[PDB]
Design a protein around this motif. Sequence first.
Motif, PDB file in Angstrom:
ATOM      1  N   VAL A 277       1.442   5.446  -0.171  1.00 19.92           N
ATOM      2  CA  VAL A 277       1.253   6.367   0.943  1.00 19.92           C
ATOM      3  C   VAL A 277       2.314   7.458   0.844  1.00 19.92           C
ATOM      4  O   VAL A 277       3.489   7.151   0.606  1.00 19.92           O
ATOM      5  CB  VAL A 277       1.437   5.623   2.275  1.00 19.92           C
TER       6      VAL A 277
ATOM      7  N   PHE B   1       5.582   5.353  -0.514  1.00 17.38           N
ATOM      8  CA  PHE B   1       5.886   3.957  -0.263  1.00 17.38           C
ATOM      9  C   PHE B   1       4.594   3.140  -0.372  1.00 17.38           C
ATOM     10  O   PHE B   1       3.482   3.666  -0.329  1.00 17.38           O
ATOM     11  CB  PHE B   1       6.592   3.822   1.087  1.00 17.38           C
TER      12      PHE B   1
ATOM     13  N   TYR C 284       3.361  -1.338   0.426  1.00 14.53           N
ATOM     14  CA  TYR C 284       3.749  -2.711   0.659  1.00 14.53           C
ATOM     15  C   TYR C 284       2.837  -3.631  -0.154  1.00 14.53           C
ATOM     16  O   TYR C 284       1.650  -3.353  -0.305  1.00 14.53           O
ATOM     17  CB  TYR C 284       3.500  -3.074   2.121  1.00 14.53           C
TER      18      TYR C 284
ATOM     19  N   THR D 209      -1.845  -5.380  -2.718  1.00 14.48           N
ATOM     20  CA  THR D 209      -0.860  -4.316  -2.599  1.00 14.48           C
ATOM     21  C   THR D 209      -1.554  -3.108  -1.996  1.00 14.48           C
ATOM     22  O   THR D 209      -2.665  -2.811  -2.393  1.00 14.48           O
ATOM     23  CB  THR D 209      -0.261  -4.042  -3.983  1.00 14.48           C
ATOM     24  N   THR D 210      -0.935  -2.444  -1.009  1.00 14.82           N
ATOM     25  CA  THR D 210      -1.547  -1.255  -0.441  1.00 14.82           C
ATOM     26  C   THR D 210      -1.482  -0.153  -1.498  1.00 14.82           C
ATOM     27  O   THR D 210      -0.616  -0.171  -2.381  1.00 14.82           O
ATOM     28  CB  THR D 210      -0.754  -0.728   0.772  1.00 14.82           C
ATOM     29  N   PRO D 211      -2.347   0.882  -1.431  1.00 17.57           N
ATOM     30  CA  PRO D 211      -2.143   2.045  -2.286  1.00 17.57           C
ATOM     31  C   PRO D 211      -0.817   2.693  -1.882  1.00 17.57           C
ATOM     32  O   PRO D 211      -0.273   2.411  -0.808  1.00 17.57           O
ATOM     33  CB  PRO D 211      -3.321   2.986  -1.956  1.00 17.57           C
TER      34      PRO D 211
END
Lengths: 206, 207
Positions: free
Chosen positions: B161, B169, B171, B157-159
């Motif tokens: 933003v 948000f 992703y 999972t991205t941090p």
Amino acid sequence: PSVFLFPPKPKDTLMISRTPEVTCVVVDVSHEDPEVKFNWYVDGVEVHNAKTKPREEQYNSTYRVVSVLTVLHQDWLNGKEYKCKVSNKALPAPIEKTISKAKGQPREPQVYTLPPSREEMTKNQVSLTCLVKGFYPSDIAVEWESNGQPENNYKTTPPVLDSDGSFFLYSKLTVDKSRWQQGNVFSCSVMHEALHNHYTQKSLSL
Amino acid sequence: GPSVFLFPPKPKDTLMISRTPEVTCVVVDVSHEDPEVKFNWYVDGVEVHNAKTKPREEQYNSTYRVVSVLTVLHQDWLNGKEYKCKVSNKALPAPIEKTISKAKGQPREPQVYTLPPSREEMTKNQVSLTCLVKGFYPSDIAVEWESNGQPENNYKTTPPVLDSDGSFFLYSKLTVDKSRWQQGNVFSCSVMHEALHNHYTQKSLSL
């Protein structure tokens, strides 16, 4: 006093019209002793073209002195080491830092575009997604455009380390729903060293 | 002399009443000569007494690290109460105080959207299931994937933003075998956030 050394901007290293630079930043330089001398090495060989930026006086009674060395794109891409030697009276010995491009075999980004969810069509603006995965190293630039022109309203995640040792990110572009419904073509353009010619662009539309 | 760091609870722990949220007060560079550390904790300024000191840890610069863990109440944290750790030690000239609390600002409910693999990806053995979570505030969130009642663990999972409207948000990407996708296996992305109904939402993805 303390020394940091920063690499070039990734886009700077891939554009014919940009000149990339390595920056050496000296903090905690005393008021009594301002003269910082920089020496710069490209693979252990001294070069002479650096320029000292004008000091900035920090508000804990110390200066910051910055030295910038323009580098040749291919030099940086070829993995040359840049060394900054910092001399100053308030240091007992010269401080030396070294930087180079991240090591490891380059891996080509896969670039896929993903249309908005049907569920998003309830909203006035929709998300166009660009997934960029399998890249190494993490130096990358991502932009969106349409009809020749940059799109203002997008955001990109930082690179995230995948489980195979490569990176991935997503870029999200937001557009008015009507522009998406009218059939406009949007493009995600990625610049990375391991792409063919260092560039790719992928498009989507309804 | 020592220095002090105060860490908030894990997003998941504040959201689920079955879990135990804690704030953590970490004291580094405690000298060998003066090793005793004392903590006082305050919730909105009221002293509490339930904190627990972990066993002493040894650092490799000839120093100790001392840690105090305070159990907090879920609604307290989410209501934005301030947690203060006061650290006393003989090598400190004066006690050190640090305070933490939930980021300020009106919460905003995340929108959760699942997006299937790109057709161009379908030439590979493994495909990317994507979950877009957008429009949430504050950034405290947890995201997981499931299929057929059991955890699917091959995701990243991205941090969060910061979006240009002041919400966040991220992703999440689940990697699965192409074959499992093509057979119409149902996957789901679950999101936990304070602004969601019961702090929880799940969205399906499937061919």
